[PDB]
């Protein structure tokens, strides 16, 4: 299958990304607390539901939340302010809270069932969010010996996510709170606060600038 692209809501960020976030890929955003990672996730969960000529994929969403940071009313606000029905947009987000890293890993395997179910509907899953990818791993795997163990478990989790992205033509979008370790996302985006309330994004391994607004994010 040909890759699809999802607009982030920001023309600046879309250009940095080569045209939006890609299906058949894991895009990791990383940065300090407050850098806007979860706001971008909320915005993408709306944008993907737009038709293709508007920057979406007519897609549904699966969201794995490890920090209780998903806000249904933020989805509804972004949707309404972009001209979409807030309740229809929210309904197309399947939502699960991951209680620990082992549950998080099972939830990714479990997501395949709904992905298959929806694959030939008019709104197949096109975006899978894990927010936060790393928080449970960081809390659970700590101290001498934990680097190798945590990295190996994360590698398996990321392999599972890569398979879903690649097999079912889904964009996987993950967040990581930061600030030497290896990473296996296909693309890593460093996010930080800038002047005037702006957020600045840089590809890791130019910079885009955007604001967090009632439309989610925009230039
Ligand atoms: C991941 C995210 C949301 C979900 N809803 N049901 C299963 C599942 C897995």
- How far is the N terminus from the C terminus? 31 Å
Alpha-carbon Rg, integer: 16 Å
List the bound ligands.
1H-indazole
* Estimated structural class: alpha/beta
N to C succession of SSEs = EHEEHEHHEHEHHEEEEE
Main beta sheet = 9 strands, mixed
| Helix content estimate | 25-40%
Major sheet strand order: 5-4-6-7-3-8-9-10-11
Q: Per the principal axes of the C-alpha atoms, what is the gross shape?
A: globular
Strand content: 25-35%
How many helices?
Answer: 7
In summary, what is this structure?
The protein has 7 helices and 11 strands. With 219 residues, it is of the alpha/beta class.
Structure commentary:
The protein is α/β, with parallel strands linked by helices and 219 residues long. The chain contains 7 helices and 11 strands. It has one domain. The strands form 2 sheets. It has a 9-stranded mixed beta sheet, sandwiched between helices. Strand 9 (199-204) and strand 10 (207-213) form a beta hairpin. The structure holds 1H-indazole. The PDB classes it as dna binding protein. The entry lists the keywords RAD51, RadA, inhibition, fbdd, PPI, DNA binding protein. The assembly is monomeric. HumRadA1 soaked with 5 mM indazole in 10% DMSO.
């Amino acid at each position: 299958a040909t890759i699809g692209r999802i607009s982030t809501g920001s023309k600046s960020l879309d250009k940095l990304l080569g045209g939006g976030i890609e299906t058949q890929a894991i895009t990791e955003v990383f940065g300090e607390f407050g850098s806007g990672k979860t706001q971008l996730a909320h915005t993408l969960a709306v944008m993907v539901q737009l038709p293709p000529e508007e920057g979406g994929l007519n897609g549904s969403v699966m969201w794995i939340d490890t920090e209780n940071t998903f806000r249904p009313e933020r989805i509804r606000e972004i949707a309404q302010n972009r001209g979409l029905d807030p309740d229809e947009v929210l309904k197309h987000i399947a939502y699960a809270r991951a209680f620990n890293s082992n549950h998080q890993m099972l939830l990714v395997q479990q997501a395949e069932d709904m992905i298959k179910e929806l694959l030939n509907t008019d709104r197949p899953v096109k975006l899978l969010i894990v927010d936060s990818l790393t928080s449970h791993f960081r809390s659970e795997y700590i101290g001498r010996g934990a680097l190798a163990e945590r990295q190996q478990k994360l590698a398996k989790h990321l392999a599972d996510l890569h398979r879903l992205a690649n097999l079912y033509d889904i964009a996987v979008f993950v967040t990581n709170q930061v600030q030497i370790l290896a990473h296996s996302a296909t693309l890593r985006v460093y996010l930080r606060k800038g002047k005037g309330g702006k957020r600045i994004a840089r590809l890791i391994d130019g910079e885009a600038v955007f604001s967090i607004t009632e439309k989610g994010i925009e230039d």
